[PDB]
Design a protein around this nucleic acid. Structure first.
Ligand SMILES: CC[C@H]1OC(=O)[C@H](C)[C@@H](O[C@H]2C[C@@](C)(OC)[C@@H](O)[C@H](C)O2)[C@H](C)[C@@H](O[C@@H]2O[C@H](C)C[C@H](N(C)C)[C@H]2O)[C@](C)(O)C[C@@H](C)C(=O)[C@H](C)[C@@H](O)[C@]1(C)O
Ligand SMILES: [Mg+2]
Ligand SMILES: [Mg+2]
Ligand SMILES: [Mg+2]
Ligand SMILES: [Mg+2]
Ligand SMILES: [Mg+2]
Ligand SMILES: [Mg+2]
Ligand SMILES: [Mg+2]
Ligand SMILES: [Mg+2]
Ligand SMILES: [Mg+2]
Ligand SMILES: [Mg+2]
Ligand SMILES: [Mg+2]
Ligand SMILES: [Mg+2]
Ligand SMILES: [Mg+2]
Ligand SMILES: [Mg+2]
Ligand SMILES: [Mg+2]
Ligand SMILES: [Mg+2]
Ligand SMILES: [Mg+2]
Ligand SMILES: [Mg+2]
Ligand SMILES: [Mg+2]
Ligand SMILES: [Mg+2]
Ligand SMILES: [Mg+2]
Ligand SMILES: [Mg+2]
Ligand SMILES: [Mg+2]
Ligand SMILES: [Mg+2]
Ligand SMILES: [Mg+2]
Ligand SMILES: [Mg+2]
Ligand SMILES: [Mg+2]
Ligand SMILES: [Mg+2]
Ligand SMILES: [Mg+2]
Ligand SMILES: [Mg+2]
Ligand SMILES: [Mg+2]
Ligand SMILES: [Mg+2]
Ligand SMILES: [Mg+2]
Ligand SMILES: [Mg+2]
Ligand SMILES: [Mg+2]
Ligand SMILES: [Mg+2]
Ligand SMILES: [Mg+2]
Ligand SMILES: [Mg+2]
Ligand SMILES: [Mg+2]
Ligand SMILES: [Mg+2]
Ligand SMILES: [Mg+2]
Ligand SMILES: [Mg+2]
Ligand SMILES: [Mg+2]
Ligand SMILES: [Mg+2]
Ligand SMILES: [Mg+2]
Ligand SMILES: [Mg+2]
Ligand SMILES: [Mg+2]
Ligand SMILES: [Mg+2]
Ligand SMILES: [Mg+2]
Ligand SMILES: [Mg+2]
Ligand SMILES: [Mg+2]
Ligand SMILES: [Mg+2]
Ligand SMILES: [Mg+2]
Ligand SMILES: [Mg+2]
Ligand SMILES: [Mg+2]
Ligand SMILES: [Mg+2]
Ligand SMILES: [Mg+2]
Ligand SMILES: [Mg+2]
Ligand SMILES: [Mg+2]
Ligand SMILES: [Mg+2]
Ligand SMILES: [Mg+2]
Ligand SMILES: [Mg+2]
Ligand SMILES: [Mg+2]
Ligand SMILES: [Mg+2]
Ligand SMILES: [Mg+2]
Ligand SMILES: [Mg+2]
Ligand SMILES: [Mg+2]
Ligand SMILES: [Mg+2]
Ligand SMILES: [Mg+2]
Ligand SMILES: [Mg+2]
Ligand SMILES: [Mg+2]
Ligand SMILES: [Mg+2]
Ligand SMILES: [Mg+2]
Ligand SMILES: [Mg+2]
Ligand SMILES: [Mg+2]
Ligand SMILES: [Mg+2]
Ligand SMILES: [Mg+2]
Ligand SMILES: [Mg+2]
Ligand SMILES: [Mg+2]
Ligand SMILES: [Mg+2]
Ligand SMILES: [Mg+2]
Ligand SMILES: [Mg+2]
Ligand SMILES: [Mg+2]
Ligand SMILES: [Mg+2]
Ligand SMILES: [Mg+2]
Ligand SMILES: [Mg+2]
Ligand SMILES: [Mg+2]
Ligand SMILES: [Mg+2]
Ligand SMILES: [Mg+2]
Ligand SMILES: [Mg+2]
Ligand SMILES: [Mg+2]
Ligand SMILES: [Mg+2]
Ligand SMILES: [Mg+2]
Ligand SMILES: [Mg+2]
Ligand SMILES: [Mg+2]
Ligand SMILES: [Mg+2]
Ligand SMILES: [Mg+2]
Ligand SMILES: [Mg+2]
Ligand SMILES: [Mg+2]
Ligand SMILES: [Mg+2]
Ligand SMILES: [Mg+2]
Ligand SMILES: [Mg+2]
Ligand SMILES: [Mg+2]
Ligand SMILES: [Mg+2]
Ligand SMILES: [Mg+2]
Ligand SMILES: [Mg+2]
Ligand SMILES: [Mg+2]
Ligand SMILES: [Mg+2]
Ligand SMILES: [Mg+2]
Ligand SMILES: [Mg+2]
Ligand SMILES: [Mg+2]
Ligand SMILES: [Mg+2]
Ligand SMILES: [Mg+2]
Ligand SMILES: [Mg+2]
Ligand SMILES: [Mg+2]
Ligand SMILES: [Mg+2]
Ligand SMILES: [Mg+2]
Ligand SMILES: [Mg+2]
Ligand SMILES: [Mg+2]
Ligand SMILES: [Mg+2]
Ligand SMILES: [Mg+2]
Ligand SMILES: [Mg+2]
Ligand SMILES: [Mg+2]
Ligand SMILES: [Mg+2]
Ligand SMILES: [Mg+2]
Ligand SMILES: [Mg+2]
Ligand SMILES: [Mg+2]
Ligand SMILES: [Mg+2]
Ligand SMILES: [Mg+2]
Ligand SMILES: [Mg+2]
Ligand SMILES: [Mg+2]
Ligand SMILES: [Mg+2]
Ligand SMILES: [Mg+2]
Ligand SMILES: [Mg+2]
Ligand SMILES: [Mg+2]
Ligand SMILES: [Mg+2]
Ligand SMILES: [Mg+2]
Ligand SMILES: [Mg+2]
Ligand SMILES: [Mg+2]
Ligand SMILES: [Mg+2]
Ligand SMILES: [Mg+2]
Ligand SMILES: [Mg+2]
Ligand SMILES: [Mg+2]
Ligand SMILES: [Mg+2]
Ligand SMILES: [Mg+2]
Ligand SMILES: [Mg+2]
Ligand SMILES: [Mg+2]
Ligand SMILES: [Mg+2]
Ligand SMILES: [Mg+2]
Ligand SMILES: [Mg+2]
Ligand SMILES: [Mg+2]
Ligand SMILES: [Mg+2]
Ligand SMILES: [Mg+2]
Ligand SMILES: [Mg+2]
Ligand SMILES: [Mg+2]
Ligand SMILES: [Mg+2]
Ligand SMILES: [Mg+2]
Ligand SMILES: [Mg+2]
Ligand SMILES: [Mg+2]
Ligand SMILES: [Mg+2]
Ligand SMILES: [Mg+2]
Ligand SMILES: [Mg+2]
Ligand SMILES: [Mg+2]
Ligand SMILES: [Mg+2]
Ligand SMILES: [Mg+2]
Ligand SMILES: [Mg+2]
Ligand SMILES: [Mg+2]
Ligand SMILES: [Mg+2]
Ligand SMILES: [Mg+2]
Ligand SMILES: [Mg+2]
Ligand SMILES: [Mg+2]
Ligand SMILES: [Mg+2]
Ligand SMILES: [Mg+2]
Ligand SMILES: [Mg+2]
Ligand SMILES: [Mg+2]
Ligand SMILES: [Mg+2]
Ligand SMILES: [Mg+2]
Ligand SMILES: [Mg+2]
Ligand SMILES: [Mg+2]
Ligand SMILES: [Mg+2]
Ligand SMILES: [Mg+2]
Ligand SMILES: [Mg+2]
Ligand SMILES: [Mg+2]
Ligand SMILES: [Mg+2]
Ligand SMILES: [Mg+2]
Ligand SMILES: [Mg+2]
Ligand SMILES: [Mg+2]
Ligand SMILES: [Mg+2]
Ligand SMILES: [Mg+2]
Ligand SMILES: [Mg+2]
Ligand SMILES: [Mg+2]
Ligand SMILES: [Mg+2]
Ligand SMILES: [Mg+2]
Ligand SMILES: [Mg+2]
Ligand SMILES: [Mg+2]
Ligand SMILES: [Mg+2]
Ligand SMILES: [Mg+2]
Ligand SMILES: [Mg+2]
Ligand SMILES: [Mg+2]
Ligand SMILES: [Mg+2]
Ligand SMILES: [Mg+2]
Ligand SMILES: [Mg+2]
Ligand SMILES: [Mg+2]
Ligand SMILES: [Mg+2]
Ligand SMILES: [Mg+2]
Ligand SMILES: [Mg+2]
Ligand SMILES: [Mg+2]
Ligand SMILES: [Mg+2]
Ligand SMILES: [Mg+2]
Ligand SMILES: [Mg+2]
Ligand SMILES: [Mg+2]
Ligand SMILES: [Mg+2]
Ligand SMILES: [Mg+2]
Ligand SMILES: [Mg+2]
Ligand SMILES: [Mg+2]
Ligand SMILES: [Mg+2]
Ligand SMILES: [Mg+2]
Ligand SMILES: [Mg+2]
Ligand SMILES: [Mg+2]
Ligand SMILES: [Mg+2]
Ligand SMILES: [Mg+2]
Ligand SMILES: [Mg+2]
Ligand SMILES: [Mg+2]
Ligand SMILES: [Mg+2]
Ligand SMILES: [Mg+2]
Ligand SMILES: [Mg+2]
Ligand SMILES: [Mg+2]
Ligand SMILES: [Mg+2]
Ligand SMILES: [Mg+2]
Ligand SMILES: [Mg+2]
Ligand SMILES: [Mg+2]
Ligand SMILES: [Mg+2]
Ligand SMILES: [Mg+2]
Ligand SMILES: [Mg+2]
Ligand SMILES: [Mg+2]
Ligand SMILES: [Mg+2]
Ligand SMILES: [Mg+2]
Ligand SMILES: [Mg+2]
Ligand SMILES: [Mg+2]
Ligand SMILES: [Mg+2]
Ligand SMILES: [Mg+2]
Ligand SMILES: [Mg+2]
Ligand SMILES: [Mg+2]
Ligand SMILES: [Mg+2]
Ligand SMILES: [Mg+2]
Ligand SMILES: [Mg+2]
Ligand SMILES: [Mg+2]
Ligand SMILES: [Mg+2]
Ligand SMILES: [Mg+2]
Lengths: 275, 48
RNA sequence: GAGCUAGCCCUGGCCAGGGUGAAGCUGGGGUGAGACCCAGUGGAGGCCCGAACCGGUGGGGGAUGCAAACCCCUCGGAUGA
RNA sequence: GAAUGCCGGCAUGAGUAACGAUAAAGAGGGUGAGAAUCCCUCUCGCCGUAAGCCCAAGGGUUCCUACGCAAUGGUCGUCAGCGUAGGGUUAGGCGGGACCUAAGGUGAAGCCGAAAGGCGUAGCCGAAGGGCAGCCGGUUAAUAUUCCGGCCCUUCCCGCAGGUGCGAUGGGGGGACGCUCUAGGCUAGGGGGACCGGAGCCAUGGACGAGCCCGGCCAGAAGCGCAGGGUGGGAGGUAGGCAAAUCCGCCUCCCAACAAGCUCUGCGUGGUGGGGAAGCCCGGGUGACAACCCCCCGAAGCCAGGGAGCCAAGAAAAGCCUCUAAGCACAACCUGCGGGAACCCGUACCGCAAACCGACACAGGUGGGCGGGUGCAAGAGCACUCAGGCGCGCGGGAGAACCCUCGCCAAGGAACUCUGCAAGUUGGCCCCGUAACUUCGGGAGAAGGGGUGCUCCCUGGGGUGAUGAGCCCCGGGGAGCCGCAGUGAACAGGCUCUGGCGACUGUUUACCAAAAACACAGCUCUCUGCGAACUCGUAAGAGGAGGUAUAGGGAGCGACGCUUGCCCGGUGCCGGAAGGUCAAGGGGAGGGGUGCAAGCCCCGAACCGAAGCCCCGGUGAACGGCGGCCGUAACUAUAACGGUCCUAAGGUAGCGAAAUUCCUUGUCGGGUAAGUUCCGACCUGCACGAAAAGCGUAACGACCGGAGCGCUGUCUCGGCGAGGGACCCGGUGAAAUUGAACUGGCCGUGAAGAUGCGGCCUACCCGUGGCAGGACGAAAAGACCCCGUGGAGCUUUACUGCAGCC
RNA sequence: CGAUGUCGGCUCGUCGCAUCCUGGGGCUGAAGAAGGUCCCAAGGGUUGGGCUGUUCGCCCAUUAAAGCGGCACGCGAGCUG
RNA sequence: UGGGAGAGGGUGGUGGAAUUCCCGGAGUAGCGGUGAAAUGCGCAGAUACCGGGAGGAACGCCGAUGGCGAAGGCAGCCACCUGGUCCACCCGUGACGCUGAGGCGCGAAAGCGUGGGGAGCAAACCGGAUUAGAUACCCGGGUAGUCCACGCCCUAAACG
RNA sequence: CCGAGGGUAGGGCCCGUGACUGGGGCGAAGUCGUAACAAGGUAGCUGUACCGGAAGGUGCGGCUGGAU
């Protein structure tokens, strides 16, 4: 449950912070963090290729186990649940009876002290990873591989989940977090349950500086610029778009579809998304 | 106020120096050009 | 050509002193249990006053200048974008 | 002879402006050809969170000494950061290298590109980050953690002794980390002492004193002591840490547990080695056998990898330790001790500035550390002062206008003016006290008031210590004293009411705009299923993201409150396996040229044949748009109501003479003696209106408007005074400008505004301080405007291409 | 057009007279007082405020009166902006 | 103490019918709708029929004139957690009772905030009719909302 | 010292009045429609919500004070 503040400054009026009440360990596993090269939106040429990036808090990257079929049949115990600044979900530290220590995305409801396990035989239980073909139809899953052995790709953000709607040959049918209906191969691994921290979206950033902490630099409207800069630039005084609303680079940006036409995965998208 | 020349020996050597010039087609042409002209100095002096 | 200037990256440094008194915690009251109230403690904040520091609001001076943007008075921010 | 020509030389302005912070000077002695300017002494003033001291960058001999004074120095010069010459910088421990990695850079493998080249893993390079062994004093004209003295320490080699499964680029541990607040104990630093040491001193009315003045320490190995940091021990199993592993990880058992123990730092002590003032007498010597003690205040520094809270969740790699592999166990490593060995570069000087960046010895710019005392609540604020450093490289006079900076003002008190612009006022602390409204925080320092010194007396609590004294910190009560006045000097809000705009803190046109602009949390639409979309790139490859729809891109709107209506005909976008049109290609009816002929060669109808466009739908927080004329109510007036034309549909709620209203100073009301502004209303809104959002909104604003109180030189209306200039004298000595000039007024004339032509009038020659009417005065080949088949930025349903996409 | 700074205000004046006041007159539908109108007359005078950038104008309170015009819409090497 | 009846409440599950949409088959000239129509939908293959899938909401028969609750109100079926209540016995306490200004809690629907959900229905809205008009009644569309969770609102022909 | 009161500043309550504005009551014979009373020609009423020249309409739930 999000936490409010009393209005003792202008910004505390609506600023809200997470409860952190599920967190049980306030520093990371030294053997599993590595440094995070901040890019500032720049590429190997040095050019801003994503605008309005930089200046955020320093962070260490916690290595997450997105495969899990690494260690079939080897159970692990949930030793702590910790904060990860590289993702919306919380992460959970796993101590394998193997003696190996790993991080996973923390599903909703997972408890410090329970044991999880990965494999075809695993119990349909929160925290376990199975190939999709062995999960009963209707089950809510997360951290879903898209192609077998290639890594958990879908449903990873705070509060998300996919639902198994049915089967067809080597493939199962998933309803993704977007509501699209896709075929995913049955040998693709997924973890039972939804991702935790569902309250994440109810957070009110509260002031400008909070965004600046996250590496989000201020965003400038096209309408505020000059014609050298943007299709919406210029005009005397304020001005409507005066053309179909466009990006800085000329393409239309109110409805124009941009998925590539002849893309091969189209044979596996059943129904495009919703709302 | 703060003016535009703020001398810095390391900046000078790493930007205009001999080894900066030789690493680059345009840099070598600069050296080739300045030799042909007879410049006493092919590159700015910086004490290190 | 980014030793000026603009943004980002890595690594360091700086912010006198004073004021306000958030949550929480403790005790007390209250209740079926609660909410809640009171006191104490506490020390939150793009919080308040004000140097350094960063600015440049109003006025005067300067105008072959001390200066190709300066000087005086006054004024903004000063734990934070 | 002219090109605002080019190069040079020399004039004019002119002995004119100026001589670079208004911190300030005077005299005596010296030197010398020459002295306001050099040296010495005494007096005076200035800085003192600096205008003193120490590092770093940058500069590169500027350092020291001797000899100089042509030029440089805004004057002078005997002086100098200047000329000549000689000298001067010393390290195993300080900084960098023979160590480590960061961004980044480079790059065996590999990938990509016409060439040049672009990428790229490991590796390498890369520091003000990590790591690593020196402190105090003396010494030189000039270097000193470097030389010397004292006391300490590090690595490498070799040897000896003891010990041990030794051995690494490999495995593991550690290194290793945020922000705010902060404990205990110290240390730096500081204040006091009736105690200790000291050359003296008694003045001018008093004091021979518990008098005055001066100083009462620094470094230090082992050991010890105080305060902290770090750290569980044993066993059994073991499938993980890409071989192995006794290490680490995991599981179980026993023990230990605020500890202790072991270890590592800090501080104190410590053998020992140093230092040591005033005053006096020529940097020195004396003092001096100097003394070196006690109490208090006390860090932001140290113990430190300390503690707590919080969210935005806070480098790497080596050194180090541990595990084992090849190996090797005559080895090798560890511990102790001994001897030997220990290289390269920097070191002068300046360093908030006359030596750096600004053409200058330039009121500007320049990162880190130290920065004493008293008082004022605190403090790095303010005043004065220490140590130390300065009086700013032209001066001497005079005491006009006028200018600048500053002080005061009778009566009035905003009457000034676009505007209270500017300047008054207010001003710190303590106490009383404080309104609408409000998002309950605020508004609030609201407003408004009272207090503030000194003496005596009684008394409350804390810190140190011992519980006491002493010192130190917060207070309370009573009685008095002096002045015009007690934050007695300096630093230190004027307040209120009411509109517009923007929620707010922020940001911006470096150098005429700081704002109502930008940003902003928040709201909505839309794209994106991950080799994502999008972006940069020919590509490779990057970013997006080591992210995954509670995510990322694009767009508008802009806290919050209550809201956001009607039009899908046109444009856009979205959907639409039909039909229409549609290119290359397929097809080949039928034609044609040539050949004697087999043949060769060319044209070519129907027909099959994408996207796109047409066509059919959807779509507004997509581009956008949201009417006209006429009639009508039992006074008049005005029309709830009706008629008709047109549209895709005819503006809803709210708001309105508005940051929008042309007519306009609309009309009414308020405020005023008087109000083109202001505020409240009205509504025939030239030309508001709902996310280019509509209407509100507490708080906020160096935004913009209107009003009142307070107080004023803003004004009636000016006066006086201060200093720096202007003026005079000595020194040094520019500038734009300049066809040449022997350069008056009127009325005319003239290319239409005449010193220069006409006719009158006036007028002896030459300067100095002043004032600005003219010389269509200077400056800049008018920015406005036009012209040029001149240029550039920008736009689009202008033309034609190209990227990209299909 | 190889530049003639362009509204208003302030300051400083000066000139014309088609005279606002003051002085002298005639006519009056001039009883007196007060006016009207024309003539002569430029010596002097011709106020302080509210509103607006304003010139102008309106308004308040007075006045003998609250004149109208020229001087590059007088005057920015005089100021303001 | 021992028994019973009950849509009393709360949480979690879960079953079939039907509507809608999507897919596949089969099939062809209309379907729908009304007082009669038109709008709408349909040869771009609808309606009608079969198989498949997704999703929401409400629970037919039982069912009553019935039951339960203080009122608002409560209806598929299962489990758990929980309230009230009635009857038998005549066992215990010994007037411990009644009401109740204030207070506190509960309170249909609609409405509001923040999320989710969305089949059907449907204010507003659009269109087609009707009509003098028709900002209605009737038809075809359709957004809030109706549904879930949490928090407000506290109304009623909250009536016997 | 206390002290009538005078002064300065800020609050509270009441009364009067105000451009304009809101609905209300009343008023012999105005304009528009016909909402209700009959099944009032869509049964009515109701809380609420949205809408419309106006009565009203519609949605959701409720009442019978509804007809046949
Ligand atoms: C500070 C020192 C500067 O002086 C000014 O700034 C004054 C205050 C300007 O007026 C400012 C301010 C203002 C309002 O003039 C008062 C404005 O009009 C002009 C544009 O600039 C001047 C004089 C301008 O002249 C004016 O230019 C006008 C276009 C036409 C006018 N004249 C021919 C009629 C002429 O005098 C102009 C162009 O800057 C002069 C040219 C030569 C310059 O560039 C010179 C070098 C100036 O920059 C300057 C001397 O350094
Ligand atoms: Mg809050
Ligand atoms: Mg959590
Ligand atoms: Mg690591
Ligand atoms: Mg990267
Ligand atoms: Mg790169
Ligand atoms: Mg981008
Ligand atoms: Mg960026
Ligand atoms: Mg994320
Ligand atoms: Mg997380
Ligand atoms: Mg797959
Ligand atoms: Mg949000
Ligand atoms: Mg961040
Ligand atoms: Mg953003
Ligand atoms: Mg923006
Ligand atoms: Mg713009
Ligand atoms: Mg550009
Ligand atoms: Mg362009
Ligand atoms: Mg453009
Ligand atoms: Mg535009
Ligand atoms: Mg614009
Ligand atoms: Mg604009
Ligand atoms: Mg406009
Ligand atoms: Mg437009
Ligand atoms: Mg466009
Ligand atoms: Mg594109
Ligand atoms: Mg989709
Ligand atoms: Mg600068
Ligand atoms: Mg600076
Ligand atoms: Mg350098
Ligand atoms: Mg450097
Ligand atoms: Mg450099
Ligand atoms: Mg640099
Ligand atoms: Mg470079
Ligand atoms: Mg180089
Ligand atoms: Mg080449
Ligand atoms: Mg040579
Ligand atoms: Mg070169
Ligand atoms: Mg730079
Ligand atoms: Mg530099
Ligand atoms: Mg600060
Ligand atoms: Mg502080
Ligand atoms: Mg206080
Ligand atoms: Mg307190
Ligand atoms: Mg606590
Ligand atoms: Mg304050
Ligand atoms: Mg200024
Ligand atoms: Mg001022
Ligand atoms: Mg200044
Ligand atoms: Mg000042
Ligand atoms: Mg401040
Ligand atoms: Mg501060
Ligand atoms: Mg000639
Ligand atoms: Mg010339
Ligand atoms: Mg020329
Ligand atoms: Mg020349
Ligand atoms: Mg020349
Ligand atoms: Mg010359
Ligand atoms: Mg010559
Ligand atoms: Mg010459
Ligand atoms: Mg001369
Ligand atoms: Mg002269
Ligand atoms: Mg001069
Ligand atoms: Mg000067
Ligand atoms: Mg000064
Ligand atoms: Mg003297
Ligand atoms: Mg002298
Ligand atoms: Mg001299
Ligand atoms: Mg001399
Ligand atoms: Mg001198
Ligand atoms: Mg001297
Ligand atoms: Mg001091
Ligand atoms: Mg130099
Ligand atoms: Mg000389
Ligand atoms: Mg000389
Ligand atoms: Mg000589
Ligand atoms: Mg000279
Ligand atoms: Mg000089
Ligand atoms: Mg001499
Ligand atoms: Mg030397
Ligand atoms: Mg040494
Ligand atoms: Mg060597
Ligand atoms: Mg190429
Ligand atoms: Mg390098
Ligand atoms: Mg290196
Ligand atoms: Mg280093
Ligand atoms: Mg070292
Ligand atoms: Mg030492
Ligand atoms: Mg050993
Ligand atoms: Mg070993
Ligand atoms: Mg660590
Ligand atoms: Mg770390
Ligand atoms: Mg670090
Ligand atoms: Mg933080
Ligand atoms: Mg002290
Ligand atoms: Mg093992
Ligand atoms: Mg340490
Ligand atoms: Mg001595
Ligand atoms: Mg002696
Ligand atoms: Mg500090
Ligand atoms: Mg520490
Ligand atoms: Mg690394
Ligand atoms: Mg072997
Ligand atoms: Mg051997
Ligand atoms: Mg060597
Ligand atoms: Mg040295
Ligand atoms: Mg300075
Ligand atoms: Mg400094
Ligand atoms: Mg100097
Ligand atoms: Mg120099
Ligand atoms: Mg000087
Ligand atoms: Mg200087
Ligand atoms: Mg001292
Ligand atoms: Mg003070
Ligand atoms: Mg001086
Ligand atoms: Mg000075
Ligand atoms: Mg003088
Ligand atoms: Mg004189
Ligand atoms: Mg001064
Ligand atoms: Mg005074
Ligand atoms: Mg006065
Ligand atoms: Mg007054
Ligand atoms: Mg007054
Ligand atoms: Mg005024
Ligand atoms: Mg103004
Ligand atoms: Mg004003
Ligand atoms: Mg004052
Ligand atoms: Mg004061
Ligand atoms: Mg009030
Ligand atoms: Mg109040
Ligand atoms: Mg008020
Ligand atoms: Mg208000
Ligand atoms: Mg309040
Ligand atoms: Mg509160
Ligand atoms: Mg106060
Ligand atoms: Mg006060
Ligand atoms: Mg007192
Ligand atoms: Mg006194
Ligand atoms: Mg007295
Ligand atoms: Mg203040
Ligand atoms: Mg603002
Ligand atoms: Mg703004
Ligand atoms: Mg607002
Ligand atoms: Mg804002
Ligand atoms: Mg701020
Ligand atoms: Mg600017
Ligand atoms: Mg500019
Ligand atoms: Mg500029
Ligand atoms: Mg300015
Ligand atoms: Mg501006
Ligand atoms: Mg500002
Ligand atoms: Mg802006
Ligand atoms: Mg919003
Ligand atoms: Mg591109
Ligand atoms: Mg990446
Ligand atoms: Mg908003
Ligand atoms: Mg805002
Ligand atoms: Mg904005
Ligand atoms: Mg409100
Ligand atoms: Mg349309
Ligand atoms: Mg359309
Ligand atoms: Mg359409
Ligand atoms: Mg086609
Ligand atoms: Mg349009
Ligand atoms: Mg249109
Ligand atoms: Mg009538
Ligand atoms: Mg409406
Ligand atoms: Mg109006
Ligand atoms: Mg308005
Ligand atoms: Mg308008
Ligand atoms: Mg108007
Ligand atoms: Mg107007
Ligand atoms: Mg008026
Ligand atoms: Mg009035
Ligand atoms: Mg009107
Ligand atoms: Mg728009
Ligand atoms: Mg607009
Ligand atoms: Mg407000
Ligand atoms: Mg502001
Ligand atoms: Mg402002
Ligand atoms: Mg006022
Ligand atoms: Mg004056
Ligand atoms: Mg004077
Ligand atoms: Mg004379
Ligand atoms: Mg002379
Ligand atoms: Mg000279
Ligand atoms: Mg001549
Ligand atoms: Mg002549
Ligand atoms: Mg002459
Ligand atoms: Mg003359
Ligand atoms: Mg004359
Ligand atoms: Mg003429
Ligand atoms: Mg003439
Ligand atoms: Mg003449
Ligand atoms: Mg002549
Ligand atoms: Mg002639
Ligand atoms: Mg003549
Ligand atoms: Mg003549
Ligand atoms: Mg003169
Ligand atoms: Mg003149
Ligand atoms: Mg003039
Ligand atoms: Mg001329
Ligand atoms: Mg002139
Ligand atoms: Mg002229
Ligand atoms: Mg030219
Ligand atoms: Mg021209
Ligand atoms: Mg020009
Ligand atoms: Mg122009
Ligand atoms: Mg023209
Ligand atoms: Mg042409
Ligand atoms: Mg032509
Ligand atoms: Mg052209
Ligand atoms: Mg160009
Ligand atoms: Mg062009
Ligand atoms: Mg012209
Ligand atoms: Mg000229
Ligand atoms: Mg000119
Ligand atoms: Mg005036
Ligand atoms: Mg008269
Ligand atoms: Mg008479
Ligand atoms: Mg009469
Ligand atoms: Mg007459
Ligand atoms: Mg006259
Ligand atoms: Mg006017
Ligand atoms: Mg008269
Ligand atoms: Mg005139
Ligand atoms: Mg004229
Ligand atoms: Mg004119
Ligand atoms: Mg005029
Ligand atoms: Mg004119
Ligand atoms: Mg001017
Ligand atoms: Mg003017
Ligand atoms: Mg002039
Ligand atoms: Mg002139
Ligand atoms: Mg059809
Ligand atoms: Mg067909
Ligand atoms: Mg569904
Ligand atoms: Mg009994
Ligand atoms: Mg309710
Ligand atoms: Mg209709
Ligand atoms: Mg219709
Ligand atoms: Mg009809
Ligand atoms: Mg719906
Ligand atoms: Mg009933
Ligand atoms: Mg009295
Ligand atoms: Mg009638
Ligand atoms: Mg009826
Ligand atoms: Mg009826
Ligand atoms: Mg009817
Ligand atoms: Mg309706």
């Amino acid at each position: 449950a999000v936490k409010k503040f009393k209005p003792y400054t202008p910004s505390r009026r609506f600023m809200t912070v997470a409860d952190f009440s599920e967190i049980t360990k306030t520093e990371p596993e030294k053997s599993l963090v590595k440094p995070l090269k901040k890019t500032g939106g720049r590429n190997n040429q040095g050019r801003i290729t994503v605008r309005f990036r930089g200046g955020g808090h320093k962070r260490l990257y916690r290595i997450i186990d997105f495969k899990r079929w690494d260690k079939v049949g080897i159970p692990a115990k949930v030793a702590a649940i910790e904060y990860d600044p590289n993702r919306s979900a919380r992460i959970a530290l796993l101590h394998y009876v193997d003696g190996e220590k790993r991080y996973i995305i923390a599903p909703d409801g997972l408890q410090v002290g329970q044991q999880v396990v990965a494999g075809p035989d695993a119990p349909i239980q929160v925290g376990n990873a199975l190939p999709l073909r062995f999960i009963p139809v209707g089950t809510v899953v997360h951290a879903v591989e898209l192609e077998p052995k290639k890594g958990a790709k879908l449903a990873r953000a705070a509060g998300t989940s996919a639902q198994i709607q049915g089967r067809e040959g080597d493939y199962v049918i998933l309803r993704l977090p977007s509501g699209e209906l896709r075929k995913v191969h049955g040998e693709c691994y997924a973890t039972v349950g939804a991702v935790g921290n569902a309250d994440h979206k109810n957070i009110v950033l509260g002031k400008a500086g909070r965004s600046r902490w996250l590496g989000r630099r201020p965003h400038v409207r096209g309408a505020a610029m000059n014609p050298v800069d943007h299709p919406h630039g210029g005009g005397e005084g304020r001005a409507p778009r005066g053309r179909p609303p466009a990006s800085p680079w000329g393409w239309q940006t109110k409805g124009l579809k941009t998925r590539k036409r002849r893309k091969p995965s189209s044979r596996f998208i059943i129904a495009r998304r919703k709302k | 106020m703060k003016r535009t020349w703020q001398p810095n020996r390391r900046k000078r050597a790493k930007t205009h120096g001999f080894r900066a010039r030789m690493r680059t087609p345009g840099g070598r042409k600069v050296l080739k050009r300045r030799r042909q002209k007879g410049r006493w100095r092919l590159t700015p002096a910086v004490r290190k």
